[PDB]
RNA sequence: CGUCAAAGCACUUUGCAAAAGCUAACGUAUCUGUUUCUUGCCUUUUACCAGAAACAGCCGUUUGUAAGGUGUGCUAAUUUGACUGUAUAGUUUUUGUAAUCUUUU
């Protein structure tokens, strides 16, 4: 079987593009490649992009998120 | 170990009460006597032989309680009880996703 942090470890090596959803905000989402992370589920995204229901793709740069705000992490 | 409560504390002397509550050594010990019966050895009764049942004494044991004694402390020490006793800002409770607005009855 596949534990959750070992699954995220694969997303670092493969450098796969991953879109991230927020806690109490469906209107907003994010994108980017995963460089690194930690035990508390904080993430360092590279070439991250802010997306909406309108599809308003707005660029950001290399950012960091708090683990308290995530909900879904999905491949491609 | 920690908290709280009570109390002097440890050691000791007497007094006074108790000690099958659901089959169990108040004493991992153990002796004498009385009465009533049964058998022994016997004729003087006592003194005795060795079984029973029913009562008694004696040598001891434990507990609670009361007053004391010695040594120590009453600017402390010790005992005794009681307790829902631990420390976590990063995902399942105590360091917040909250804040704010509007319509309906």
Swiss-Prot record:
InterPro entries hit by this protein: LSM_dom_sf, Sm, Sm_dom_euk/arc, snRNP-E
Please provide the record's keywords in A-Z order. Answer: Cytoplasm, mRNA processing, mRNA splicing, Nucleus, Ribonucleoprotein, RNA-binding, Spliceosome
Q: Where is the Sm domain?
A: 5-76
Places the protein is found = Cytoplasm; Nucleus
Which terms in the GO cellular component ontology are assigned?
A: cytosol; nucleus; pICln-Sm protein complex; post-mRNA release spliceosomal complex; precatalytic spliceosome; U1 snRNP; U2 snRNP; U2-type prespliceosome
What's an example Gene Ontology biological process for this entry?
A: spliceosomal snRNP assembly
The GO terms this record gives for MF are: RNA binding
The answer to whether UniProt assigns keyword Manganese to this entry is no
Tell me, what does this protein do in biology? Involved in pre-mRNA splicing. Binds and is required for the stability of snRNA U1, U2, U4 and U5 which contain a highly conserved structural motif called the Sm binding site. Involved in cap modification.
UniProt lists the family membership as follows: Belongs to the snRNP Sm proteins family.
Q: Which PANTHER family match?
A: SMALL NUCLEAR RIBONUCLEOPROTEIN E (PTHR11193)
Could you tell me what this protein is called? Answer: Small nuclear ribonucleoprotein E
